[PDB]
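Purpose: get a first structural picture of the assembly so the mutagenesis plan has something to point at.
Setup: two entries, given in the order below. No constraints added.
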Amino acid sequence: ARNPKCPRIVKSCHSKTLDKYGLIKYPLTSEKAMKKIEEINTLVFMCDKRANKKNIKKSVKNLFGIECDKVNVLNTLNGDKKAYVRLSGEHDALEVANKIG
RNA sequence: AGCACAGUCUUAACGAUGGAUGUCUUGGUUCCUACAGCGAUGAAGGCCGCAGCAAAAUGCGAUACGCAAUGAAAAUUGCAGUGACUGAAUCAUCAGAAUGCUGAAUGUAAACUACACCAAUUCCCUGGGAAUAGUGGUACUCCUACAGAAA
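Result (structure tokens, whole complex):
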């Protein structure tokens, strides 16, 4: 195998591969989304176009402390990802409602 | 409150209609002077983004219509924020940054955000502790050097 004198590229800079804060952009506040949150504990989030579904699940749990039963995603005509996140049943929409407004 | 044939033609006055003329002009134009190549240290081209309110040019690249540094240097306002008794607000300079996805484009690909394999990898702290499947490397030809194989 290789044993170079020096690697060709060295990245000095801070990481920017895709920040978790920015991977998930913001909760979506639509009437449809409000009904989903209210009735089945399902949160709708706008997320980056290149975002990974597992990472979106990680990001929700990191940023809001709340666990996901299933995460369903879509690439929108609004240029971004729209993630429908059904919450695990021991955590509640009311807590999320306090955080979002 | 009476009087006027109407139409057609012609004439004048006063206008509609139209954009000529004139007047301009941060543009062209040619000549002359002067320097004059960028690229695997990933160009040009092309996409995809990026403004608090932001569509198109311009500008810029996930640090995104400015960053750092310098010289000017107190304003900036469409709304709204912001700053001043000098590394902020405004400009110009711009030598340090950064540098998306591609594209020769180079891991195999291609009406694909498809698919391999090898390295797992990054940060903090002064010899230790935390994070992330993330990040790299892997084209073809050549050359110089080295290697264990062969005749």
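The longest strand of chain A covers residues 68-75.
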